[PDB]
Design an enzyme around this catalytic site. Sequence first.
Site, PDB file in Angstrom:
ATOM      1  N   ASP A   8       0.830  -1.206   0.000  1.00 24.15           N
ATOM      2  CA  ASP A   8       0.000   0.000   0.000  1.00 24.15           C
ATOM      3  C   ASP A   8       0.872   1.267   0.000  1.00 24.15           C
TER       4      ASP A   8
ATOM      5  N   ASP B 280       3.415   6.123  -3.061  1.00 29.26           N
ATOM      6  CA  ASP B 280       4.632   6.812  -3.535  1.00 29.26           C
ATOM      7  C   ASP B 280       4.311   7.564  -4.833  1.00 29.26           C
ATOM      8  OD1 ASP B 280       6.983   4.058  -2.769  1.00 29.26           O
ATOM      9  OD2 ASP B 280       6.288   5.707  -1.486  1.00 29.26           O
TER      10      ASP B 280
ATOM     11  N   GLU C 115      14.978   1.844  -8.994  1.00 30.60           N
ATOM     12  CA  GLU C 115      15.899   0.836  -9.515  1.00 30.60           C
ATOM     13  C   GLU C 115      15.583  -0.548  -8.979  1.00 30.60           C
ATOM     14  N   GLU C 116      15.298  -0.626  -7.679  1.00 30.98           N
ATOM     15  CA  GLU C 116      14.975  -1.902  -7.036  1.00 30.98           C
ATOM     16  C   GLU C 116      13.696  -1.821  -6.196  1.00 30.98           C
ATOM     17  OE1 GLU C 116      19.124  -3.038  -5.317  1.00 30.98           O
ATOM     18  OE2 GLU C 116      18.538  -4.672  -6.689  1.00 30.98           O
TER      19      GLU C 116
ATOM     20  N   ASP D 248      11.672  13.405  -2.527  1.00 23.93           N
ATOM     21  CA  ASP D 248      11.486  12.011  -2.148  1.00 23.93           C
ATOM     22  C   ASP D 248      10.119  12.043  -1.442  1.00 23.93           C
ATOM     23  OD1 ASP D 248      12.147   9.354  -1.740  1.00 23.93           O
ATOM     24  OD2 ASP D 248      13.900   9.787  -0.487  1.00 23.93           O
TER      25      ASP D 248
ATOM     26  N   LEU E 192       7.920   9.726  -0.115  1.00 20.80           N
ATOM     27  CA  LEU E 192       7.790   8.962   1.126  1.00 20.80           C
ATOM     28  C   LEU E 192       9.161   8.370   1.447  1.00 20.80           C
ATOM     29  CD1 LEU E 192       4.371   7.181   0.588  1.00 20.80           C
ATOM     30  CD2 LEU E 192       4.866   9.113   2.080  1.00 20.80           C
ATOM     31  N   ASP E 193       9.419   8.107   2.726  1.00 22.64           N
ATOM     32  CA  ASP E 193      10.713   7.574   3.149  1.00 22.64           C
ATOM     33  C   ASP E 193      10.918   6.063   3.020  1.00 22.64           C
ATOM     34  OD1 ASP E 193       9.152   6.757   5.320  1.00 22.64           O
ATOM     35  OD2 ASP E 193      10.488   7.641   6.818  1.00 22.64           O
TER      36      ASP E 193
ATOM     37  N   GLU F 140      18.405  10.951  -0.021  1.00 22.38           N
ATOM     38  CA  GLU F 140      18.127  10.865   1.415  1.00 22.38           C
ATOM     39  C   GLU F 140      19.192  11.386   2.357  1.00 22.38           C
ATOM     40  OE1 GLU F 140      17.053   6.685   0.870  1.00 22.38           O
ATOM     41  OE2 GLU F 140      16.239   7.848  -0.798  1.00 22.38           O
TER      42      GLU F 140
END
Lengths: 333, 323, 327, 325
Positions: D51, D56, D79-80, D100, D102-103, D273
Amino acid sequence: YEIITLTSWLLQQEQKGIIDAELTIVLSSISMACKQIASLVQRANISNLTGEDQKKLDVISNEVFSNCLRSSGRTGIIASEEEDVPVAVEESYSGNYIVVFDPLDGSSNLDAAVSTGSIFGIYSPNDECLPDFGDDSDDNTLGTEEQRCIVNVCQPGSNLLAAGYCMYSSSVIFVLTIGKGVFVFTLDPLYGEFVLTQENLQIPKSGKIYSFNEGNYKLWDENLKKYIDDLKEPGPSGKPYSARYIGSLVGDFHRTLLYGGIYGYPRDKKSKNGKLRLLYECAPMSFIVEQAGGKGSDGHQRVLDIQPTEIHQRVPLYIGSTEEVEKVEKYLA
Amino acid sequence: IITLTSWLLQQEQKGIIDAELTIVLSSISMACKQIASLVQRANISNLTGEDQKKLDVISNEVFSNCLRSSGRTGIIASEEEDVPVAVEESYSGNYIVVFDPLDGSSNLDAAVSTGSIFGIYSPNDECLPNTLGTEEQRCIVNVCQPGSNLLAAGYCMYSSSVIFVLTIGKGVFVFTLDPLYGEFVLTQENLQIPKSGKIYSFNEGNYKLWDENLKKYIDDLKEPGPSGKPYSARYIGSLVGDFHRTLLYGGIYGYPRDKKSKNGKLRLLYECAPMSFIVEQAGGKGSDGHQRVLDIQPTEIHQRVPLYIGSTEEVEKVEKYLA
Amino acid sequence: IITLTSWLLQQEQKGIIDAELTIVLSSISMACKQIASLVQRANISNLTGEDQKKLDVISNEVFSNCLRSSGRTGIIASEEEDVPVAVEESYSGNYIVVFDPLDGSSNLDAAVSTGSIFGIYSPNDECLPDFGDNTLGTEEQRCIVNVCQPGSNLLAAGYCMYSSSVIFVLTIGKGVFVFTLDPLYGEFVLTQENLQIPKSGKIYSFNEGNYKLWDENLKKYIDDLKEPGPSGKPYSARYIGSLVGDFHRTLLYGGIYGYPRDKKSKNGKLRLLYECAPMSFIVEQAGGKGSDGHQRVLDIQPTEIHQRVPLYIGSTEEVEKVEKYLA
Amino acid sequence: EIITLTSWLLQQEQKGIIDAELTIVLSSISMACKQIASLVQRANISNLTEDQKKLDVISNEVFSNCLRSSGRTGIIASEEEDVPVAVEESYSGNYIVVFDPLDGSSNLDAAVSTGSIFGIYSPNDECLPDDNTLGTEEQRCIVNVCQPGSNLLAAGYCMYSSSVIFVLTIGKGVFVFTLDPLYGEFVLTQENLQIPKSGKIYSFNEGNYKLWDENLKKYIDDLKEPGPSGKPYSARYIGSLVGDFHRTLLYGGIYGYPRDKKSKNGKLRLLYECAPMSFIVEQAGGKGSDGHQRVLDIQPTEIHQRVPLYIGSTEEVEKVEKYLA
């Protein structure tokens, strides 16, 4: 004791045996539908970004009502004849209750500039009027036969158990009567709950305030014209009657209920039988006013003595303080 | 969806208004959000603590707190029952805000709606040295000249919807409060009041206290023209409510003079001036029956004046009957 | 969209709960809506560590006002670094609500989340004196400890978490139900029915800073969790410091949460009646286990006023694993 | 008395600290955060009609819409198991915002909190032009255009937890703004925040203990030694980068996401980040290190370059660096 919410109040009336759990659920569901409609009204301008602006709101409101009452019964819609608001009629699966719901009090943008509201009446029927549902039956619309059954089954004078309204204005007010007085609940914007703010409301026996659309003065009978003229006569302190007319049936009625006075929607040269519908608007309002110690008349007789005989029956309405309504009745005799 | 904040920042970037005024306008809107909530919960708040009289007081305090970063605020006390006005003077001496917290002191007139009215002036003198004395009031009147130094004006209506109406000199803009996200959203740009409208807003209960001039005009409005359709009458009793409806749908609103009130009831500086400036920006007219309201300079702060406001053709019609 | 109010009214109709309890539960959810707002605006309200302690007190007053129509409420004062507990006793004498306003008195542990915990009992006597300092004395606390028996008369239990989302978790004896607060309409909406905590979960929640204060039993169990199994993935470690926050995450994703005894606290820190009992009842209704390391928490009858107990709660297989190391 | 983000930004503009264009960018970013906060609060309900990842994407769309009056925005695809980054480039060519949304992309780590992280740069060039996704040529441009060591003008984050907190630094201290649920505005609740010089609190995922180097294991082990008094370090690890960082900022201590056998270069991305977080921590009087050197001193080469992170109180970060030498 301190905070009495609508839910707690309904549960207390049930413990007292005044109403049954099934009706507690119907009334609770109606208030939930009103919370949502209030939100729709408040954001109308915004929702319209991304004048039939009040006519479309009528429709969405009826759908909100249907969804909130899906656990009690099925709901049909009695289509608008003229510039009327379409009425939602819900019939319980058990056959014990029928709810006649008027989503909004009008279809005019002008009359809804500052306020509007929902009106409802709960009856205990002898028949089953509504059929079943449908797979791809988009239209809920009730037919001539079904509309007839409801008019015959819903009798204001013998089976109207409860009535009330929810006003959407600078404040959201839920007014309810289950046969033993009028109770006022105010919505707390903060916690999303209706809070009891007034018990056993009593409308003043008199009040020097009149609510009529005087733009129609020359279309009224000479009877009414003289009554209107005499209200402008500075009586006592040399202070005549105050005139207040919002144009919103719920708004004007609520103000009359709290501060006294008289509200009227008489018959005129164009609308020979008035404009307000007897079953959908006048009956619930008259039941409420009588519970608050007031009077609801058509100019000659008690509104609740009139038995609906037509699908969209109209009637003139004089409602409010007892002494004020009695005064207009003396001029119309 | 353009919010009030984004819209104000864009006007500032355009050089139309300076940062200081952006802060004043933004603070006023913040005070209105809070007052709206107070109005909505009045019944509940009164369960645990003359209902529209103390709401006047609390609202003025909310205004003062929201504008403390711009300047100091004094209060012009109410004579009779009238509403106490908040006057804020910027630390820099560049702006003065005259704030009418609520449009009335009557519970009856506030049954369904009410609102705040404000005007922003560019002063010449520094008047502020809680309540302002006679010497300060005198200064405020000589400094705030509606006809020459009124830069911006607006109001916030509290009804079934919370509407913020504003004009900074180049048209009228309407912002609707989103109950969901707590932000004012632009819902109408360059609002134009219709040139005519068959709707009149007067308290006809005072009909026999009016001059024969006015009675004649009122009587003729009831004559069904060539359509067998007379004028519609609508009167809430709420100045902001009746004005707003007139602004959107056209018509005429009036608060004339009578036998016992040779000058009407509405206050010139606090109510009539901001309303007249707004109506003129929307393409309408604000008159006292004989002249433009904005052409009148108060001699006393509490000065009153009759008011005929709304559609240009409607206001011009009443002036013709009062000549 | 089923709201908490509609759901409660439906259970009352089926006869599962009576009208009086429907009012109590409805009032508690109301109190939680208000407390949530207090938590969200704490920084702002304080413009007018011990900011968490003061919030404890205001929250108990909110609880009292919302439940005044059901009964009177007293407060079991915060002696040590414990949160003061609110105890409400119905006028009718049918129910007692033990309410923990917030899950802690530390600002650090409430940096991102906190919550209220409650339990509803059906007493066999009257303990609350009278009111109308609502602090309960030694005698009243004794009566409450005797009257409240988690193993026999705990009828309902639940909590309300205040985090990035406001979640109301409730059990009336027939499964766990999750309600999410809609910021929009100010109502709790049913988002999960009959929640089941996974039978296993490779996540452990312990304060490893106290590792050298633990018994060799526990140290070994803790050590083996770090061993990457044949999958090359060891256990994940998550510890917020918020009892409600750590418990809720355990309830949704499985795993084990523990607040063991150590050299400084020879009997554990969590209180049996006020915290461990309601939590254990909830975990058992979701299909999990609540143990003190050797036995079922709900089997222990509270015998003292300030009684504490070690706690291992969560997925059945995870809790059974720690018990096997402590035996 | 009561200072809102809007009033505060306008005052800095009057002070000549930031220009009107940047005032609009920052104001627009906070507006995107109010909306994302609402999405997070109603996630369970919106999902009625795993979810974290879908959240994102929607968040990046909200960002794009709120910043459409400042510039165009592209998306650097995951990327992943990462979060897709939104990159906005002003029409004027004066600013670039790396956002960014969401973290994280894990439901577990977002059980109680999450947040948005952003950095604002002043480039020497102009990168941006079904796929609002940036290509290899555009990605290689951003990495060379955005240098946290020399052109990072402003940075901050918005935490979504029991409280919605907006933390910002425009180069002269850290400022904290709390969202008032009532009036929908960010209110200044703390000026010139200073992270404590030391803190007996450590934030690490000890589940990976046996995957760490003997260096780190030694450091981690020694923290458990009840020192002076008889009170060992406290351990707190939410799993939420913004949540763990915020707590470290207010109460002191150390947060770390070291390299392990499974992830040879750490998991946190340097540009998206670590850079913004390190700039903020340094403005609050703290330290952001990769274990041996200052994070901001490192220059990005790859689009999704990763780096180990040790961030927090100066004395705590200096202590771990002592054990990793």
